[PDB]
Design a protein around this ligand. Structure first.
Ligand SMILES: [Mg+2]
Lengths: 57, 381, 470, 119
């Protein structure tokens, strides 16, 4: 039983380590997509503003 | 191609809406036949309820069921189709004619090949034809097949007339275009005559994003929403109504007493099931509650072109809300729903008649008794 | 003398006058025309001057629909801005943007007093040097989010939480205690809800101390953006002439700003960020600076704000949030459990909650209650649910007092007496501080929670528990 | 045309069940990505087990793609497709490797490919 308890705690620690690594990689890819969206939004907004301003003339 | 139309009176397309002093609070119900709508998101005569969703879901099926289910009542219907295939319009007209629904229906159409001005002016013509009956003492219902096509036609017209663009090239007054139209549906007072006009606009989203421009413009005009989702469409929930986000600001006052007494419990327990579902050892009551939720999810769904009279609705709702279904497995629930109604086809008819004539729940004990009898006559799979 | 119409492009008109006779900016002009044949319609229109374009031409915005206008019609200069009636004749009646009754009780006599719609804000030397607290009579407001004389409060909530009941209760309490009136302005909202509110106010009886102005979704952009000024000038008369303390309710301030943008592009102005008018903060400031607490009286305004798509970084909510002193949040969760009003105690904020304003005792009691509620919120969710219940000492007592304090924030209103026999109460602030302190100390720990429900002062609670068998 | 009165009643139920299992598998992708397959209930593991097989059996080998891969190409009538997916949904072929389902015409070819794989 004591051997079993030691094994249990070791397994839980290793599983948590793997889960944390996977979460970090997901964060990385999400940040890439976020930067793409940020640039697209800036471009579209400035294009709309200039297109509206050019209409008076 | 059936010959000319012999009319004598004309109405302006642009007219002002009734004022604050001309209206009355909404109290009468509009019966659609769909249990989810009639129970969780009630709709009353004189209201404006928005149906928003995606191209996959069957909004037009909801509209056609609602129009068909108005056979017994005294209501004229108007169907306005904006930017649709002419073939689909012909199929809709054929479906309407088969069910004998062209005794009280007018169809106004502007297909996708027509010039933009007609697509922009179609809803105003529909509501102007409705207002002729509204201002005499009659009740009208108007359906707008899509308003996001009227918006695009208006934007194209304004850009071609060389008017400054706005957000996403839409003109500045794109909220006014829809608010001015949807405010023409009202419930008149007794001095005005007592007529009404109900409106059911349709809106389509892209990838289920309701934070967009036009969906948010039209959400803040109507008295509630009916949100249909696609992830619930493929999970088996065929009406697909997301009761978490659907709402009805007139709700409660647009129901009969029998349904008022029973719908609150359904709302409460479905909300509890969906709230505690996310985290799903477990507590002894918890699993039971989950089962209850599942039963509700099984009892809300229904097939196409199967309208259920309100009496029967409330009946089954009651038979569910007090746990009488807990003795029958979930996969058999729908079968119960099929066999209960026919059991009332020859038994307990007086009950139904009472529910029809006093709009109130009958002697509860008797109902329970009948339920018990039916259960005695049911075979559990 | 008289001008003529040059262009008609939607809600914007152009008028040409004679040399040296141009009207000033913000003036009002009238078109009154009768059809000369069957190819014409009758016209009765009011316009407001916006710009001087040069060459004896002005650009104006219409207050109604422009259908039926013809290039060549004759326009008359009134000589002054829009003028609305003020005084005791406006109490219990309903008006529109131009100051005309839309009920059916008659017309205001032409020999009355009428005030213009546009005027400057009060000066620095004639404002209040001290912050004063407004006494509402509610218990949750007076403890966790006090109101300020001359301040601005943002009310957050929708359907199913009952904000009209809070509106009516505030009107009744203020009018009864401080002898003030109220003005309600509906700016670009639904007409159904306006009719509902009018009939509720008629039923309660608080109509005879209120003035109502309505400009809603069905109306052109010009009428929606000049209706809050009509209510404001109706309210300012009582502050400046009778020296009263007035309440001003605004149905949706956001719509105001929105309406402006809808005409900006048509006036010939380059767009700013997110397609808004370049003159946004100036307009909002020129509106919101006229409600203050002067040396005579004060105007305090409760404003309902709608955030588009719950995006708080939008220019309009971001601009209007810099004028607010407090926020009041109504929650459906507390309304389901039977707490009236449904004001959220952990989300309502105020800038007056400071020991230098209310006092040291008030601040300590309020902070103790807030931290007790926060402890309850944290503990009762992750613990005592999912089968992790436990009965630690000092955790029995914390939830015991927390439940006995959450139900003491509910109250019985006078306007709810038509559906319930309880007359209703007006609780001062010292009394509720004393009651909450006594509950916190555990003196009233030997009573059931049903005694703390729909009751005013703390002592009355005991009488309730006296009749409940405990 | 996916209506019960147009294509039949068996076809409609088979298609709806296949779509339901694919949607359920789609819902579980994130938690499999982060945690793994060891933190799931038995029903969820069964759902994944059948969903991978269905997703691989939706593929095919084409006549015009022969010059790329080499396989001659396949043609399947409707009734055979309905039968095969009905058998897959019933757990009849739950023991075969998940790779035997890729790029085949019918389900008898799945059986033959599994046989030639040493199982
Ligand atoms: Mg459709």
């Amino acid at each position: 039983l004591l051997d079993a308890k030691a094994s249990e705690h070791a397994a839980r620690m290793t599983a948590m380590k793997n889960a944390t690594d996977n979460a970090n990689e997901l964060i990385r890819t999400l940040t890439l997509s976020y930067n793409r969206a940020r640039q697209a939004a800036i471009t579209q907004e400035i294009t709309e503003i200039v297109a509206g301003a050019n209409a008076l003339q | 191609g059936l010959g000319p139309v012999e009319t004598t009176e004309t109405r302006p397309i642009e007219s002002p809406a009734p004022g604050v002093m001309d209206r009355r609070s909404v109290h009468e119900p509009l019966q659609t036949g769909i249990k989810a709508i009639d129970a969780l998101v009630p709709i009353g005569r004189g209201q404006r309820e928005l149906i928003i969703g995606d191209r996959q879901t069957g909004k037009t099926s909801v509209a056609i069921d609602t129009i068909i289910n108005q056979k017994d009542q005294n209501m004229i219907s108007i169907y306005v189709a904006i930017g649709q295939k002419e073939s689909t319009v012909r199929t809709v007209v054929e479906t309407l004619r088969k069910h004998g629904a062209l005794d009280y229906t007018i169809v106004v159409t502007a297909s996708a090949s027509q010039p933009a001005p007609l697509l922009f002016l179609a809803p105003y013509a529909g509501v102007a034809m409705g207002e002729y009956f509204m201002y005499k003492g009659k009740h009208v219902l108007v359906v707008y097949d899509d308003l996001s096509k009227q918006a695009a036609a208006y934007r194209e017209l304004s850009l071609l007339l060389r008017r400054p663009p706005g957000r996403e090239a839409y003109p500045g007054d794109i909220f006014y275009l829809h608010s001015r139209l949807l405010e023409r549906a009202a419930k008149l007072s007794d001095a005005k005559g007592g007529g009404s006009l109900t409106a059911l606009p349709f809106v389509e989203t892209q990838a289920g994003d309701i934070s967009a421009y036009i969906p948010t413009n039209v959400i803040s005009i109507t008295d509630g929403q009916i949100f249909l989702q696609s992830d619930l469409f493929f999970s088996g929930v065929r009406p697909a109504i997301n009761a978490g986000l659907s709402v009805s600001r007139v709700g409660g006052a647009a129901q009969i007493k029998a349904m008022k007494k029973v719908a609150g419990t359904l709302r409460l327990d479905l909300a509890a099931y969906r709230e505690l579902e996310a985290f799903a050892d477990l507590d002894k009551a918890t699993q039971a509650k989950l089962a209850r939720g599942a039963r509700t999810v099984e009892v809300l769904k229904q097939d196409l072109h199967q309208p259920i009279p309100v009496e029967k609705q409330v009946l089954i709702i009651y038979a569910l809300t007090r746990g009488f279904l807990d003795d029958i497995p979930v996969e058999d629930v729908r079968r119960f729903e099929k066999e209960f109604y026919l059991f009332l086809d020859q038994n307990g008819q007086h009950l139904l008649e009472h529910i029809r004539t006093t709009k109130d729940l009958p002697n509860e004990d008797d109902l329970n008794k009948a339920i018990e009898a039916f259960k005695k006559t049911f075979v559990v799979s | 003398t008289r001008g003529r119409v040059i262009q008609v492009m939607g809600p914007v008109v152009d008028v040409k006058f004679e040399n040296g006779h141009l009207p000033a900016i913000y003036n009002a002009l009238k078109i009154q025309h009768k059809a000369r044949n069957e190819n014409e319609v009758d016209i009765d229109l009011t316009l407001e001057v916006a710009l001087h374009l040069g060459d004896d031409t002005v650009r104006t915005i219409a207050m109604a629909s422009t259908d039926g206008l013809i290039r060549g019609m004759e326009v008359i200069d009134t000589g002054a801005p829009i003028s609305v009636p003020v005084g005791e004749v406006t109490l219990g009646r309903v008006f529109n943007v131009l100051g005309e009754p839309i009920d059916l009780e008659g017309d205001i006599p032409a020999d009355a007093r009428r005030d213009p719609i546009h005027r400057p804000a009060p000066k620095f030397e004639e404002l209040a040097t001290e912050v004063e607290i407004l006494e509402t009579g509610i218990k949750v407001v007076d403890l966790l989010a006090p109101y300020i004389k001359g301040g601005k409060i943002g009310l957050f909530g929708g359907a199913g939480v009952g904000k009209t009941v809070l509106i009516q209760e505030l009107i009744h309490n203020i009018a009864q205690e401080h002898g003030g009136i109220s003005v309600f302005a509906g700016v670009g909202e639904r007409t159904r809800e306006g009719n509902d509110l009018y009939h509720e106010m008629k039923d309660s009886g608080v109509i005879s101390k209120t003035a109502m102005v309505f400009g809603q979704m069905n109306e052109p952009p010009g009428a929606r953006m000049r209706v809050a000024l009509t209510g404001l000038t109706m309210a300012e008369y009582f502050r400046d002439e009778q020296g009263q303390d007035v309440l001003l309710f605004i149905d949706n301030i956001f719509r105001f700003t929105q309406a402006g943008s809808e005409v900006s592009a048509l006036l010939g102005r380059m767009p700013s960020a997110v397609g808004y008018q370049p003159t946004l903060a100036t307009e909002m400031g020129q509106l919101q600076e006229r409600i203050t607490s002067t040396a005579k009286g004060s105007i305090t305004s409760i404003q309902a704000i709608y955030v588009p798509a719950d995006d708080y970084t939008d220019p309009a909510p971001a601009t209007t949030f810099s004028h607010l002193d407090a926020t009041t949040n109504l929650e459906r969760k507390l309304a389901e459990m039977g707490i009236y009003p449904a004001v959220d105690p952990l989300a309502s904020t105020s800038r007056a909650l400071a020991p230098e304003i209310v006092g040291e005792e008030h601040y300590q009691v309020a902070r103790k209650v807030q931290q007790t509620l926060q402890r309850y919120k944290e503990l009762q969710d992750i613990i005592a649910i999912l089968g992790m219940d436990e009965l630690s000492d000092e955790d029995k007592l914390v939830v015991h007092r927390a439940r006995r304090i959450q139900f003491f924030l509910s109250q019985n209103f006078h306007v709810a007496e038509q559906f319930t026999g309880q007359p209703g109460s007006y609780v001062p602030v010292k009394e509720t501080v004393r009651g909450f302190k006594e509950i916190l100390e555990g003196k009233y720990d030997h009573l059931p929670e049903d005694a703390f429900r729909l009751v005013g002062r703390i002592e009355e609670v005991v009488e309730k528990a006296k009749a409940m068998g405990v």
